[PDB]
Design an enzyme around this catalytic site. Structure first.
Site, mmCIF file in Angstrom:
data_model
loop_
_atom_site.group_PDB
_atom_site.id
_atom_site.type_symbol
_atom_site.label_atom_id
_atom_site.label_comp_id
_atom_site.label_asym_id
_atom_site.label_seq_id
_atom_site.Cartn_x
_atom_site.Cartn_y
_atom_site.Cartn_z
ATOM 1 N N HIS A 125 0.787 -1.232 0.000
ATOM 2 C CA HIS A 125 0.000 0.000 0.000
ATOM 3 C C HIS A 125 0.815 1.275 0.000
ATOM 4 O O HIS A 125 0.250 2.356 -0.125
ATOM 5 C CB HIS A 125 -0.973 0.049 1.180
ATOM 6 N N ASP A 184 -0.663 -7.297 1.697
ATOM 7 C CA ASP A 184 -0.060 -5.962 1.644
ATOM 8 C C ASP A 184 1.452 -6.088 1.571
ATOM 9 O O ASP A 184 2.145 -5.890 2.565
ATOM 10 C CB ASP A 184 -0.457 -5.182 2.895
ATOM 11 N N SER A 193 5.301 2.053 7.381
ATOM 12 C CA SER A 193 4.932 0.911 6.573
ATOM 13 C C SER A 193 6.044 0.091 5.942
ATOM 14 O O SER A 193 6.696 -0.680 6.633
ATOM 15 C CB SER A 193 3.928 1.339 5.517
#
Ligand SMILES: *C[C@@](*)(O)[C@H](CCCNC(N)=[NH2+])NC(=O)[C@@H]1CCCN1C(=O)[C@H](N)Cc1ccccc1
Ligand SMILES: *[C@H]1O[C@H](CO)[C@@H](O)[C@H](O)[C@H]1NC(C)=O
Ligand code: NA
Lengths: 259, 282, 41
Positions: free
Chosen positions: A43, A99, A205
């Site tokens: 993402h 992800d 992330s």
């Protein structure tokens, strides 16, 4: 990273930094797994709710760093992305499943004492190590903490951050949320009743969740920082991508040309 | 069991303050915005490029802390206020079978109990903390010569050098970006300059001396960087790039002409430079 | 377990930090992970 700590320059060579070209802006952490492949949270590139969908041109990674600020000619190597790999069965509409994303550097880089790759969990090392209770390692240049001062980003450290978070057991993970969980992701952190604390946060992330195998003093990236509700809140835990379980996909895509 | 600690309180807002007289909701939603607007501003004073140095840290942590300790307060405020909101929402349903309305999430919920005693105190700490910072800095500068900022003239002098040298690399870039054999290494150069140079529109300010020093060497190196990788030889003199003297779209003539000269430069250039390079490649 | 011709080099040496590992230098919070592995013995 919340409850973070200044890394020790040369602590996470495989630590890449997904940077956006223009407007110059830090996007995510990442992971170097060879001399031309870097692994990150799917993402970080694409995520329609935030009108996100970057491409090779839109950005460029930067390996072997420490200071997010200034350019480090001595050690810093800047490289452009050739092709980008997001996961097919990647589910964002609902819960960030699969992800994970692969990035192929336009030109293979020369490894220095600061740009060394990490290992991928092992079919056996995965089991031996991925057990609730064990502590892993998370690094990144994400939000130093959670802020009511929403509508503002620039809240990151200056140097690379590192926090070691223990693995939580499936039940709890699923329990502490109204968001559907999948065997393709795990949750790590400290339980409220516990003392210490910490967590990865936004703009963290892509970064790795590594562990060091006692059977061969090597670091394996067990997970990728993916999501979480808030940051270091009390009751919820941070969710990472279960990298090993996805190693099947990874392979399937690197060793592509051939079959 | 039901006891929690974690008193990371460092905020300069008096505890016995939240017991004041709550601000009229209409005039409230505004003070809130004021607040935010201060944090926004204050934070920026840090992301200020001029401070991206090793001597400033201890003085930046100082502020950063001051700023979070205050933000923590407000968070704890909202985090508490919500718990009391949930309840009075429940007791709201048990009166209206018509749940036409939905409960707001922690992220939707906004602060609704903010005395003025609270508001002032927060700002008097941030407005404070900052003035504190300006001090820490003005000091660190009277003790680190090159760090003391330039003068509208001075800064213009440096900035101009850098921008010239930079525009001198864009000559190299354009020169080989079309060279199919070096297309990439060119691109990385160009993209690497943009990186250091700063956002095109509002590039990093060349405040103090040191910044002038580094910037050149960082650009200096980035250029040598190109040659090491294409092996090509660095000419001891390349023309600079005048956006009006040879535009790739408005002065093609002087554009390709610029490249001719440059390529020739690199073609006739000696291996004398390899012994001076900024980075000790090897 | 990839072939360099497709995965690139580094696989073999992966996980060893040239400024820590390949120099017998442990980092400020390494044993900390080993504290999570065995609480007894
Ligand atoms: C991509 C990132 O850097 C970031 C990592 C956040 C880690 N957070 C904590 N607490 N350890 N990911 C995100 O911000 C993701 C992607 C988009 C939404 N999101 C969230 O974490 C939300 N907070 C929760 C969520 C919303 C929708 C779908 C899945 C999760
Ligand atoms: C942007 O990437 C490709 C461009 O072709 C497109 O298919 C994709 O749907 C876009 N991403 C988003 C924001 O949906
Ligand atoms: Na937590």
């Amino acid at each position: 990273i919340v409850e973070g700590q200044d890394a020790e320059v040369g602590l996470s060579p495989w630590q890449v930094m997904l940077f956006r070209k223009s407007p110059q802006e830090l996007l995510c952490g990442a992971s170097l797994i060879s001399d031309r492949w870097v692994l990150t949270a799917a993402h970080c590139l694409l995520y329609p709710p935030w009108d996100k969908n970057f491409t090779v041109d839109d950005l460029l990674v930067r390996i072997g760093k420490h200071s997010r600020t200034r350019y480090e000619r001595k050690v810093e190597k800047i490289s452009m992305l050739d092709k980008i790999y997001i996961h097919p069965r990647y589910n964002w509409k609902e819960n960030l499943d699969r992800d994970i994303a692969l990035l192929k550097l336009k030109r293979p880089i020369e490894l220095s004492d600061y740009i060394h790759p990490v290992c991928l969990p092992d079919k056996q090392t995965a089991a031996k190590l991925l057990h609730a209770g064990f502590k892993g390692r998370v690094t990144g240049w994400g939000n130093r903490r959670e802020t009511w001062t929403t509508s503002v980003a620039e809240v990151q450290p200056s140097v690379l951050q590192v926090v070691n978070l223990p693995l939580v057991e499936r039940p709890v993970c699923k329990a502490s949320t109204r968001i559907r969980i999948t065997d393709n992701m795990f949750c790590a952190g400290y339980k409220p009743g516990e003392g210490k604390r910490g967590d990865a946060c936004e703009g963290d992330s892509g970064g790795p969740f590594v562990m060091k195998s006692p059977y061969n003093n090597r670091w394996y990236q067990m997970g990728i920082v993916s999501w979480g509700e808030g940051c270091d809140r009390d009751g919820k835990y941070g969710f990472y991508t279960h990298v090993f379980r996805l190693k099947k996909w990874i392979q399937k895509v690197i060793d592509r040309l051939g079959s | 069991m039901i006891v929690t600690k974690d008193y990371s309180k460092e905020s300069r807002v008096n505890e016995n303050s939240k017991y004041g007289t709550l601000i009229s909701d209409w005039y409230l939603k505004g003070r809130l915005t004021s607040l935010e607007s201060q944090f926004i501003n204050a934070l920026d004073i840090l992301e200020t490029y001029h401070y991206g140095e090793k001597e400033y840290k201890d003085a930046k942590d100082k502020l950063m802390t001051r700023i979070l300790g205050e933000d923590q307060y407000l968070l704890e405020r909202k985090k508490v206020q919500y718990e009391e909101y949930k309840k009075l929402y429940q007791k709201y349903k048990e009166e209206n079978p018509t749940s036409k309305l939905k409960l707001k999430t922690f992220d939707q919920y906004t602060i609704e109990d903010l005395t003025m005693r609270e508001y002032n105190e927060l700002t008097e700490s941030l407005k404070s903390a900052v003035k504190d910072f300006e001090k820490d800095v003005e000091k660190i500068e009277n003790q680190h010569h090159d760090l003391k900022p330039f003068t509208d003239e001075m800064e213009e002098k440096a900035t101009s050098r850098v921008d010239d040298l930079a525009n001198k690399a864009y000559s190299v870039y354009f020169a080989f970006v079309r060279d199919t054999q070096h297309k990439t290494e060119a691109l990385e150069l160009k993209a690497k300059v943009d990186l250091v140079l700063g956002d095109e529109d509002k590039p990093h300010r060349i405040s103090n001396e040191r910044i002038e020093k580094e910037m050149i060497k960082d650009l200096e190196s980035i250029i040598e960087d190109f040659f090491i990788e294409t092996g090509l030889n660095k000419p001891g003199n390349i023309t600079s790039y005048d956006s009006s003297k040879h535009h790739y779209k408005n002065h093609s003539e002087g554009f390709e002409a610029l490249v001719k000269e440059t390529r020739e430069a690199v073609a006739n250039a000696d291996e004398s430079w390899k012994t001076k390079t900024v980075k000790k490649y090897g | 377990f990839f072939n360099e011709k497709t995965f690139g080099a580094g696989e073999a040496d992966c996980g060893l930090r040239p400024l820590f590992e390949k120099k017998q230098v442990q980092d400020q919070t390494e044993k900390e992970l080993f504290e999570s592995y065995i609480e007894g013995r």
